[PDB]
Structure 1
Amino acid sequence: FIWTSGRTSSSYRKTVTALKAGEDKSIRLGLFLIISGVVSLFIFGFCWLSPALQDLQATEANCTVLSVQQIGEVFECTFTCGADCRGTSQYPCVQVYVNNSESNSRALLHSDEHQLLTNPKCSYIPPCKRENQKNLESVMNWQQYWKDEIGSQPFTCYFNQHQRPDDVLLHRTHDEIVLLHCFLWPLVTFVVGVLIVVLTICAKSLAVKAEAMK
């Protein structure tokens, strides 16, 4: 068939009873779980490597706001309405600038790395709630709550002089729990695979002793 066409012609002691077959299938399973657990550990390790280093390279700092302002420009958010319905609405842009613990110089605040990447030109984005008036109201609400925060309390912040060279975050975007589960359950798979092999060999060898006893 689709492999070439026409394949170009044709181009190609046993004292234990039946229990032996079930026990050899149990060895197979336990070995396959050992391999699965190790392979999945490496697969998840390669997938988590870049996110985990990009997170580790960002240090904790103490921050204080230098200023809060609007740049007068506006941007599109997308608002949603069931099945696939979406349209766009404007929001006004705030910028916020902040004191920094590693560079001791100006940097622009970005609430989280998704906000930084969805609009790196701007400091905050409202959840899009239909009309422009509600976006502007929600930006003005956040703006007023940030503008009076002057040295009130040095809030902790996250920074990376190598890849966020003048940008600052309020949150870690890397959930430790999700990473923990991604490395724990492959380890559980491996441990269960070892115990299945061990109990199968323990049962198999005790069957011979219980046979020779008779």
Structure 2
Amino acid sequence: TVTALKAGEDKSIRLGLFLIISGVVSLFIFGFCWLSPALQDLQATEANCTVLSVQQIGEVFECTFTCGADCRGTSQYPCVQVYVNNSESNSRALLHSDEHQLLTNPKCSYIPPCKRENQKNLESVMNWQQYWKDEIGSQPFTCYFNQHQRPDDVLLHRTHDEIVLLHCFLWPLVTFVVGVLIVVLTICAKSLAVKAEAMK
């Protein structure tokens, strides 16, 4: 026959196919977006690491504080640099703590939380330095290194958390599975309703 329910059921097939396509397409989009970040992080080695020298270069860089709502606040801070041992190079390389720090100023080992007062960023860098200054010959850190591209830079932290990576690939797969269930339940309803209609 034809039936009254055909319009809603065929629209339900169009939705289920659009979700299958959108699941696969967003999987490729996130695939290319995460390709360079995921390789650039997961190619970094994990190593045991120990401090071997510390110093200030006798010169200052500028950070920018924010008040909240439209401030620049450009303010000087001491440039402290720290050199560390690692299992691959076994030689002098500059510690940068987090990746962001390296990307924003690789000549210093730290950037303080920038503030309206020069004195607070000075004492913050002193309060940070007096830790790594005493860690000379201490029990090893665990730290990250990249011999293929960064033979003289060292990191304390990863470039991204695996949670945000996982969520970007979970919801495309869930979208695809939901689309498949909509297609299957709709085709099941269409093909079973005609058996019930003949059996009535």
TM-score tier by shorter-chain length is over 0.9
List gaps (5 residues or longer) in structure 2.
none
SS at match of 2:51: strand
Deviations 1:32-84, CA, capped at 9 Å, x for gaps: 00000000000000000000000011000000000111111100000111221
Q: Aligned residues: percent identity?
A: 100
Return the offset for 1:137: 0.2
Distance 1:85 1:166 in 2: 35
SS at match of 2:151: coil
User: 1:188 and 2:188 equivalent?
Assistant: no
Distance 2:71 2:59 in 1: 27
> Are 1:16 and 1:208, in contact at CA under 8 Å, matched by a contact in 2?
no
Distance 1:78 1:153 in 2: 35
User: TM-score, normalised on structure 2?
Assistant: 0.98
Counterpart for residue 85 of structure 2: 99
SS at match of 2:90: coil
1:80 is aligned, of 66, 70, 86, to 66
Deviations 1:140-181, CA, capped at 9 Å, x for gaps: 000001111122210101000112120000000211000000
Distance 2:53 2:122 in 1: 19
Q: How does 1:11-90 map to 2 (within 5 A)?
A: 15-90=1-76
Bigger Rg, structure 1 or 2: 1
Deviations 1:74-99, CA, capped at 9 Å, x for gaps: 00000111221222110011010000
SS at match of 1:65: strand
Distance 1:24 1:138 in 2: 65
Instruction: Judge which range, 113-122 or 144-153, deviates more.
Output: 144-153
Return the offset for 1:16: 3.9
Deviations 1:175-195, CA, capped at 9 Å, x for gaps: 100000000000000000000
Deviations 1:183-213, CA, capped at 9 Å, x for gaps: 0000000000000000000000011101111
SS at match of 1:27: helix
Moved over 4 A (4+): none
Deviations 1:112-156, CA, capped at 9 Å, x for gaps: 110001001111010111111111100000000111112221010
List gaps (5 residues or longer) in structure 1.
1-14
Distance 1:69 1:106 in 2: 14
SS at match of 2:160: coil
Distance 2:100 2:49 in 1: 20
User: TM-score, normalised on structure 1?
Assistant: 0.92
Distance 1:115 1:165 in 2: 17
Return the offset for 1:100: 1.3
Aligned residues: 200
